[PDB]
From Swiss-Prot:
Residues 19-103 form the RRM domain. It comes from Homo sapiens. The modification Phosphoserine is found at residue 101. Plays a role in pre-mRNA splicing and in the regulation of alternative splicing events. Activates exon skipping of its own pre-mRNA during muscle cell differentiation. Binds to the polypyrimidine tract of introns. May promote RNA looping when bound to two separate polypyrimidine tracts in the same pre-mRNA. May promote the binding of U2 snRNP to pre-mRNA. Cooperates with RAVER1 to modulate switching between mutually exclusive exons during maturation of the TPM1 pre-mRNA. Represses the splicing of MAPT/Tau exon 10. The chain holds residues 41 to 163 of 557 of the full protein. This is Polypyrimidine tract-binding protein 1. The modification Phosphothreonine is found at residue 98. The modification Phosphotyrosine is found at residue 87.
Length: 123
RNA sequence: GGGACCUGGUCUUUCCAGGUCCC
């Protein structure tokens, strides 16, 4: 039926079992909240890496259906941040990590603004 | 051989390819 061999895939293909998205030609003046904001209307986002020093970015969806729908819309449209359109496709990686730049400190902090409860009972 | 400038590719922060200018 509508089913297929979705058990494998890569960044140059679609239907990947991985929950990771990649963005190319990423703008410079753009921030961690923008890379999250383009993936939010597509489902829950639970990880993020800003690849500053390069025009690239990475994010992780909490669900495979959120990642599947995101690129399935972005496979026919190009997202834009601060008014600047840039390319997107699946990531070749699996689960978000950071191992090569201090820029990991800003990406792991921006996710807290998009996931905290911010309720008035806090102190 | 070196430097500067522009565009494209890109899979973890870069790297790579092409064009232009100067020594």
């Amino acid at each position: 039926g509508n089913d297929s061999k979705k058990f494998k895939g890569d960044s140059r293909s679609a239907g990947v079992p991985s929950r990771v998205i990649h963005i190319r030609k990423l703008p410079i003046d753009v921030t961690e909240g923008e890379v999250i904001s383009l993936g939010l209307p597509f489902g829950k986002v639970t990880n993020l890496l800003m690849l500053k020093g390069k025009n690239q970015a990475f994010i992780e969806m909490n669900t495979e259906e959120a990642a599947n729908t995101m690129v399935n819309y972005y496979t026919s449209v190009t997202p834009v941040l601060r008014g600047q359109p840039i390319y997107i496709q699946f990531s070749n990686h699996k689960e978000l990590k950071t191992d090569s730049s201090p820029n990991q400190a800003r990406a792991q902090a921006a996710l807290q603004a998009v996931n905290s409860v911010q309720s008035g009972n806090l102190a």
